[PDB]
Amino acid sequence: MNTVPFTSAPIEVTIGIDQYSFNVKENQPFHGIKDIPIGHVHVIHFQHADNSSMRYGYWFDCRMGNFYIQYDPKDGLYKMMEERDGAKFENIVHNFKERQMMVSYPKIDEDDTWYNLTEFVQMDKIRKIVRKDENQFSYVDSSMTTVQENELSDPAHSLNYTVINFKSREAIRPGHEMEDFLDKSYYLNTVMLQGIFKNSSNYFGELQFAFLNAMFFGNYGSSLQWHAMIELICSSATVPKHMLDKLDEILYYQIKTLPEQYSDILLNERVWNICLYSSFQKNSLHNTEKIMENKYPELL
Amino acid sequence: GAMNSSNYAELFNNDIKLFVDDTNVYRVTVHKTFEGNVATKAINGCIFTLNPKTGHLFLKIIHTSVWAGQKRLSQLAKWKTAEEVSALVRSLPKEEQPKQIIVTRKAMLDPLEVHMLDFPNIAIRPTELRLPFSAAMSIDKLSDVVMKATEPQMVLFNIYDDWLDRISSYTAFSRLTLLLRALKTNEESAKMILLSDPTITIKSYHLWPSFTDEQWITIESQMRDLILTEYGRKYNV
Ligand SMILES: CC(C)COC(=O)C[C@@H]1C=CS(=O)(=O)C1
Ligand SMILES: CC(C)COC(=O)C[C@@H]1C=CS(=O)(=O)C1
């Protein structure tokens, strides 16, 4: 069980850790988060009380280093940093644990929600979508645009998701125009899975990362990416059975975790109605269809 | 974006453009079977591809053999249309290729866009105009060449005959759309108006009769009356 200590909390802020969140008051004696489960990526995220504009946060994996949080009063945000001195970190963390200045990652033993949302998400792939190689952790915020959004403006601060475009030469074989547009299996299986992602695990990892950035930061281009990756599978007539079954589980837990009050803005009616009721896979997503119909019957 | 009444003069500027109308590509007769079920029998169709500035008509005849053994023919017909328009563009020299293609039905947008991916600089546009190009098969010589085709074929007519020697392309298009609107609303009456006077003939190399300027005014008046009448007979006014 690892720990992300905080030097202090000088400004009032709502702090998220994965699907949990808590309020910290201005100069409240808060010194971090303990008991973080090893084996998963995590995200620690922030919304200042005085400016709800800009949710921002950091993806990290405690197996890759000792990470801490310190407020920067010049840039005006909580920054993640890596502490290189292992013995300084062990002594200070312990001191804080002794003074009970840390919140505990509050995982219910029965609860697989975070595993289910991050099953295929790996830090190494996050760091290729979010390029800042001098750090082992990755910063994301509400405003960052994707590579595809920028084609339609600072490249260093972009989300390099895999570009998916259904009306593109990449998606459409010359001479198979109608076939490839109405059945996207060759784009899914040959171009994307065999060619770009190499396997379905990497595809699902990017899909799950896009959803989590949409949900936690309201990142609009991430939501576009999540829906495009769903629609590419649903619009393919030929999808391996294990991928369909896994997608159903992935989407089920995403829909289950979504705040009911953000459904209106995080869910694209056209994609979901198409995917559940018109597409080749309209009858392949039983768990997702059942939770969508019971939780969000308005959208449909 | 969409072509409508507000940007209507754009049709007659010097940027090459084509209208594409697919309403006569897939044509059927519906009939009863011996068992008393219903079935369709396809007849020859055509793509109506028209340069409104010059009067060029690229009439691609769609022979019924293209439908043999195919399913979802109304969907296929849109993609076949887009395939043939793309092939036409590729066949044309660069300086003759259109800068825009305006489809008369919005369902042609995605098929045409996908077939034209190789031409990113050619804009594919819808229109809000309700154009009467479906009535092209009421022009006797066009109907005749379509029905007589025994194989796929492209035929090239000027739909304005020689009118551009005397009038502008705006006026020629207005005349064409009036004639076609009339043929669409009451074909028998429209053809009666056009052919009633035996002394006015259709030249062998033309589609419409050889009216004088004054006779065209009379003809155009009679066509407006027809359209207004039928609009009367229809709604009872
Ligand atoms: C001033 C003291 C009581 C609190 O300062 C800190 O906790 C800063 C340390 C820097 C790296 S670290 O070891 O992760 C934490
Ligand atoms: C297909 C290739 C030869 C291009 O030809 C033309 O464009 C000929 C014009 C088209 C119709 S028209 O008005 O009869 C004269």
Residue A118 per-residue DSSP state: H
Tell whether B44 is covered by a domain. yes
How far from A193 is each of A181, A300, B215, CA to CA, in Å?
17, 30, 68
Full residue range of the structural domain in which residue A153 is found: 116-299
* CA–CA distance, A194 with B68 (Å, rounded to integer): 35
Q: Which of B163, B186, B212 is the last residue of a domain?
A: B163
Clarify whether residues B170 and B140 are in a common domain: no
Clarify whether residues B79 and B16 are in a common domain: yes
**Ligand 2 centroid to B128 CA: how many Å?**
27
Method for structure elucidation: X-ray
Clarify whether residues B60 and B153 are in a common domain: yes
* CA–CA distance, A235 with B222 (Å, rounded to integer): 53
A 10 A CB-CB count for A272 gives 22
Tell whether B46 is covered by a domain. yes
Maximum distance among all Cα pairs of chain A, rounded to whole angstroms: 70
Residue B59 per-residue DSSP state: E
Which atom of ligand 1 is nearest the CA belonging to A8?
A: 4
Clarify whether residues B195 and B129 are in a common domain: no
Q: Is B42 exposed, middle or buried (0-12, 13-18, 19+ CB in 10 A)?
A: middle
Token pair recorded at residue A273:
């109605």
Q: Which of B163, B188, B204 is the last residue of a domain?
A: B163
B16, B51, B58: residue to mutate for ligand 2 pocket, most atoms within 8 A of CB: B58
* CA–CA distance, B57 with B160 (Å, rounded to integer): 9
A181 touches chain B (CB under 8 A): yes
Clarify whether residues B41 and B108 are in a common domain: yes
**CATH number of the domain encompassing residue B222:** 1.20.80.40
Torsion angle (degrees, nearest 10) of CA A236, A161, A276, A19 = 150
CB contacts of A278 in chain B (<8 Å) are none
Clarify whether residues B125 and B191 are in a common domain: no
Tell whether B1 is covered by a domain. no
Residue B127 per-residue DSSP state: B
How far from A138 is each of A207, A269, B128, CA to CA, in Å?
17, 31, 49
* CA–CA distance, A55 with A11 (Å, rounded to integer): 14
* Phi then psi dihedrals of residue B146, to 5 deg: -65, -50
Q: How many domains does chain B have?
A: 2
Which atom of ligand 1 is nearest the CA belonging to A70?
A: 8
Tell whether B145 is covered by a domain. yes
Tell whether B3 is covered by a domain. no
CB contacts of A183 in chain B (<8 Å) are none
Clarify whether residues B215 and B119 are in a common domain: no
Q: Which of B118, B133, B163 is the last residue of a domain?
A: B163
Full residue range of the structural domain in which residue B15 is found: 9-163
A168 touches chain B (CB under 8 A): yes
**CATH number of the domain encompassing residue A273:** 1.25.40.550
* CA–CA distance, B113 with A68 (Å, rounded to integer): 51
Clarify whether residues B175 and B225 are in a common domain: yes
Question: How distant is the Cα of B83 from the closest Cα of chain A, in angstroms?
Answer: 9
**Ligand 2 centroid to A268 CA: how many Å?**
46
**DSSP output for A156-199:** GG-B-PPP--SSSTTTS-TT-HHHHHH-THIIIIIIIIIIIISS
A178 touches chain B (CB under 8 A): yes
Tell whether B152 is covered by a domain. yes
How far from B75 is each of A102, A114, A173, B42, B80, CA to CA, in Å?
63, 44, 19, 15, 9
Clarify whether residues B130 and B194 are in a common domain: no
* CA–CA distance, B182 with B191 (Å, rounded to integer): 9
* CA–CA distance, A283 with A50 (Å, rounded to integer): 47
How far from B98 is each of A225, B14, B16, B121, CA to CA, in Å?
34, 11, 5, 10
Clarify whether residues B135 and B199 are in a common domain: no
Question: How distant is the Cα of B117 from the closest Cα of chain A, in angstroms?
Answer: 7
Residue B60 per-residue DSSP state: E
Please name which ligand lies nearest the alpha carbon of A83.
Answer: 1
A278 touches chain B (CB under 8 A): no
Cα–chain center distance at A300: 25
Tell whether B154 is covered by a domain. yes
Token pair recorded at residue A119:
């099953």
Clarify whether residues B47 and B145 are in a common domain: yes
* CA–CA distance, A218 with A129 (Å, rounded to integer): 17
